[PDB]
Amino acid sequence: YVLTQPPSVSVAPGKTARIACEGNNIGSKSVHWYQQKPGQAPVLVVYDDSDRPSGIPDRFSGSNSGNTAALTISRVEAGDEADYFCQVWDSNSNHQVFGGGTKVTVLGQPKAAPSVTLFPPSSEELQANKATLVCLISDFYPGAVTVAWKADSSPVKAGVETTTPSKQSNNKYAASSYLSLTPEQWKSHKSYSCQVTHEGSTVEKTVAPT
Amino acid sequence: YVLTQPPSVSVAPGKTARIACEGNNIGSKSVHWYQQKPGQAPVLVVYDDSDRPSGIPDRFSGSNSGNTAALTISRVEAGDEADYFCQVWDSNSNHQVFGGGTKVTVLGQPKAAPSVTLFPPSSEELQANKATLVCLISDFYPGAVTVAWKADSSPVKAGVETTTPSKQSNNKYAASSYLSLTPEQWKSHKSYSCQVTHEGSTVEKTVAPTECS
């Protein structure tokens, strides 16, 4: 048995998204719907065609008849951006069958410039003869930044690592850039700087030894 | 009904991987196992405790005895690297329930436990009436960790965000977790802790408010 979903559905916030799940006489079967965000397990949102489990807002509803079932998401929020899979039991094969999933994109969420917080090496770190600067980059949308570091206005490339942005519980992104140096290097400069570029705008913070 | 899986299992090529799926008398549910690779739908690899769909290698075997179901992958290959989810029927809620998933890494380099560096809010941030702690987690492989925070002795959930690990230029993984507080909150506790779990290993670092330098 084969279940066919559109690979992709786009919806603007507050509007309604429809996720079709096509199968031959799927209306005779019982449809389950799953929401899955990257790195997490699938969460059940609708079951038995149109029932919601506990904690699922009733703007999630389903329908099923003929050759087509559908998940409808009313009043779409950024938090609904995810993969949705329809699942049915198939008596002939004697086990579950999944659709290939639909990635729901919420178009046009508000852009948000990152908050940049630059930390000097910790006391526990310097007393251990180590030093690390961390540039925390949070609350930005969309999820792409560039980071550049300077030591006393001179650019620093070696020793720099920046994580790939990932989505936080508020549906904005976070990343961190960090710079490994020696306690001697740290103290031998007047200041260090972290500059973040987001959507053609730049935010730079500076830190100096106390 | 709750299914508990280990968040990560790692195995060298050609060795055996065991993925547990614990539940209270799970031995009397019928456990299905899914394999999921990045950007793909789940793929059934084992159904009804131990039955294989058509075309799954016999390296994959399921068992389901008492409090423990397990998926065993023998003579592991690189292509086995995936997320694995167990799933049972629970008509005490009357729908399927999933375990939290297990990241299986096929080891391509030495295991490395994470370096954990915990940063307090700077004096400068606190003067601007903000307070953020950052737990920097670096140089680890496989790329999966779980982070837990405490305020004095008390678990903290509010204000915590943790990034998904990402492969850095040295080919090991890094992530960070951060806790947003007010300065008043920060100064009202004697310590905060970040605890990082990496497979079997756990490291906890603590920091304390100080009245300055």
Side-chain angles (χ1 to χ4, degrees):
Chain A
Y1 195 74
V2 177
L3 297 175
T4 299
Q5 320 177 215
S8 147
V9 173
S10 284
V11 63
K15 299 286 126 188
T16 295
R18 192 193 163 74
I19 293 96
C21 178
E22 191 268 324
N24 192 297
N25 204 44
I26 191 171
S28 62
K29 303 184 187 301
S30 167
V31 181
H32 292 34
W33 289 94
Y34 285 88
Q35 182 197 63
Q36 189 187 36
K37 312 218 172 151
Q40 304 168 13
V43 190
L44 184 71
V45 295
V46 165
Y47 67 100
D48 280 310
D49 292 345
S50 50
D51 301 323
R52 280 166 305 263
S54 200
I56 298 290
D58 54 20
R59 56 195 187 84
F60 287 84
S61 60
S63 56
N64 182 19
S65 68
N67 296 337
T68 292
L71 182 64
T72 295
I73 308 178
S74 299
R75 301 209 162 142
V76 165
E77 311 174 355
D80 305 331
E81 227 173 28
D83 287 317
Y84 295 86
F85 302 89
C86 56
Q87 198 189 35
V88 298
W89 166 275
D90 181 25
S91 38
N92 274 106
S93 60
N94 189 28
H95 59 69
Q96 319 279 356
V97 165
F98 262 124
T102 303
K103 173 171 23 162
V104 175
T105 298
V106 181
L107 253 56
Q109 309 165 39
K111 293 197 183 336
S115 279
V116 182
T117 308
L118 180 60
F119 299 70
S122 51
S123 54
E124 297 89 21
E125 191 166 40
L126 293 160
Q127 83 188 353
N129 205 27
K130 296 296 178 280
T132 309
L133 304 180
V134 58
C135 185
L136 178 68
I137 312 170
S138 56
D139 289 341
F140 56 99
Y141 188 91
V145 292
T146 322
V147 190
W149 290 80
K150 299 171 200 190
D152 285 337
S153 98
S154 313
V156 167
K157 179 157 68 215
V160 174
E161 302 288 354
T162 305
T163 61
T164 304
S166 62
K167 200 170 282 185
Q168 325 160 98
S169 73
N170 68 355
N171 306 298
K172 298 190 204 147
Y173 288 82
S176 283
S177 187
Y178 53 101
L179 176 52
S180 289
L181 44 73
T182 70
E184 289 85 14
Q185 246 170 339
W186 171 236
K187 287 165 209 155
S188 90
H189 285 102
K190 292 201 190 5
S191 69
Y192 276 74
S193 291
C194 173
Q195 183 196 262
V196 184
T197 301
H198 180 259
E199 297 292 298
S201 313
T202 66
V203 178
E204 173 171 290
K205 297 303 173 76
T206 303
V207 73
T210 297
Chain B
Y1 197 61
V2 182
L3 307 152
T4 303
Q5 305 176 233
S8 68
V9 165
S10 66
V11 50
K15 270 41 164 61
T16 307
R18 161 186 182 76
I19 301 96
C21 175
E22 292 173 330
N24 168 71
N25 192 228
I26 177 163
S28 277
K29 281 83 183 168
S30 153
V31 181
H32 300 12
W33 287 94
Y34 284 94
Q35 178 197 71
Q36 191 181 25
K37 292 176 189 210
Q40 288 292 124
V43 171
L44 187 79
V45 294
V46 159
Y47 69 105
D48 186 271
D49 282 7
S50 60
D51 282 340
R52 233 164 279 128
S54 211
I56 302 296
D58 48 25
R59 307 189 291 106
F60 289 77
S61 61
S63 53
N64 182 9
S65 148
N67 291 324
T68 304
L71 171 62
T72 303
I73 313 173
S74 291
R75 285 190 314 270
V76 159
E77 306 170 17
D80 301 335
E81 192 169 281
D83 287 332
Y84 292 81
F85 302 94
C86 61
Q87 176 204 56
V88 310
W89 210 337
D90 172 63
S91 99
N92 287 15
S93 96
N94 308 296
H95 51 70
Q96 304 282 324
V97 57
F98 265 117
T102 297
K103 181 173 161 32
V104 175
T105 297
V106 184
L107 300 164
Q109 60 183 108
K111 283 198 213 177
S115 300
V116 178
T117 311
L118 177 59
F119 297 77
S122 67
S123 196
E124 153 187 79
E125 188 186 19
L126 291 159
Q127 201 286 335
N129 201 31
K130 297 263 74 153
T132 311
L133 288 87
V134 174
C135 187
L136 176 62
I137 314 170
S138 59
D139 290 334
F140 58 97
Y141 180 79
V145 290
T146 58
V147 183
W149 288 84
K150 294 179 199 79
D152 292 331
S153 58
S154 153
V156 158
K157 317 89 174 173
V160 171
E161 300 292 342
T162 308
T163 69
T164 72
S166 74
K167 184 166 278 211
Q168 297 311 126
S169 83
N170 72 351
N171 287 306
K172 303 187 186 128
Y173 286 88
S176 48
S177 177
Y178 75 87
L179 172 57
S180 307
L181 312 171
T182 66
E184 257 194 288
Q185 275 176 290
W186 162 244
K187 291 296 298 134
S188 75
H189 288 85
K190 300 213 173 270
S191 73
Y192 279 80
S193 301
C194 175
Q195 175 197 81
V196 177
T197 302
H198 183 250
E199 299 206 316
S201 313
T202 296
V203 164
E204 175 172 82
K205 302 297 190 91
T206 303
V207 289
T210 72
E211 300 236 271
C212 215
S213 50

